[PDB]
Amino acid sequence: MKGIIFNVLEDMVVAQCGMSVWNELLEKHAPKDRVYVSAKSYAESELFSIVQDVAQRLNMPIQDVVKAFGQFLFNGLASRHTDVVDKFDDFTSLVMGIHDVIHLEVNKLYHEPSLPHINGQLLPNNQIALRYSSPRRLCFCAEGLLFGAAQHFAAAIQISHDTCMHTGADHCMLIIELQNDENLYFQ
Ligand code: MNH
Ligand code: NA
Ligand SMILES: [Zn+2]
Missing domain, CATH: 1.10.260 (434 Repressor (Amino-terminal Domain))
Structure with a gap:
């Protein structure tokens, strides 16, 4: 770490x-x-x-604390790696780029970091399916970070987390709903 x-x-x-x-x-x-x-x-x-x-x-509850840290952590990362987060104009782009742009850069910035495996898929109705996988099992830290990312773009989100490594799966599915951002009007 x-x-x-x-x-x-x-x-x-x-x-x-x-x-x-x-x-x-x-x-x-x-x-x-x-x-x-x-x-x-x-x-x-x-x-x-x-x-x-x-x-x-x-x-x-320990995962409520980890989640709250994740949310604080996003801002703390964004302000220390501003050049990485300023690559994205909106929440949905940043989420779709966590793996291939952000944590990809984290491999050039840091010697041998320990990062999760993440894949985002855009769904209908402004949802994202974010698959997470890591032996560290920090999916609740990842929820926090997503809420942080949302706050950063003045967006509002909800997250469903019903496949989880903590309930026996080998990955988690974070189904993200984008409820509002500056480019969402009535729907
Ligand atoms: C919102 C988006 C977002 C998500 C869901 C996210 C997810 C994670 C999670 C979860 C971990 C903890 C380790 C693991 O195996 O799970 C982690 C670690 C990490 N991430 Mn990030 N991350 C960012 C944004 C995100 N990261 C940004 C922005 C930066 C900064 C450019 C960054 C850089 C890191 C660094 C650095 C690590 C730590 C790796 C290590 O400790 O070796 N990343
Ligand atoms: Na709006
Ligand atoms: Zn989980």
Whole structure:
């Protein structure tokens, strides 16, 4: 897991809970004097342990916390890789490009990143079928990111998530409904 993901998490924990709390999380779930360098790889278990700790402090379901992180993470990625997100003029284009443009670039920007496998298909009625697959099983982080992407383009979405790696499938299907954006009027 790249340091940048940890850095965005810090911004989140520091904003909601305070810097004193982040240093608790970090002292407890990471080796002495850890510094997350944005471009370096670190053990994904350090992230899961920090996030699991937060979920428990807040008495929240772990996937609700991961989803909320994903939503904060989109903005934090977009502002650190503005050149990548400015390639897209609307939500639907960005979703259709997560795999072949965005995470494709992430392979040129970062040494050997650990990325999911994603394929989007455009459906009738302004829906997208986004198939997700990853051994890390972070489909709820992906829901958050989609909600973040929506906020970014002043779009409104809903997501159905009824095939899931957590309920035994080898992938997830995120059926995205685009309810509104600046180019949707009556329908
Ligand atoms: C909305 C769109 C969107 C979705 C659904 C999305 C999905 C994911 C998910 C889920 C993961 C966690 C790992 C896994 O195996 O599941 C992940 C990781 C990652 N993604 Mn993104 N991603 C973006 C946008 C998205 N990404 C943008 C914008 C950037 C920045 C250019 C970016 C760059 C990354 C980086 C960097 C990683 C981390 C890889 C690693 O830690 O090694 N990407
Ligand atoms: Na509109
Ligand atoms: Zn899932």
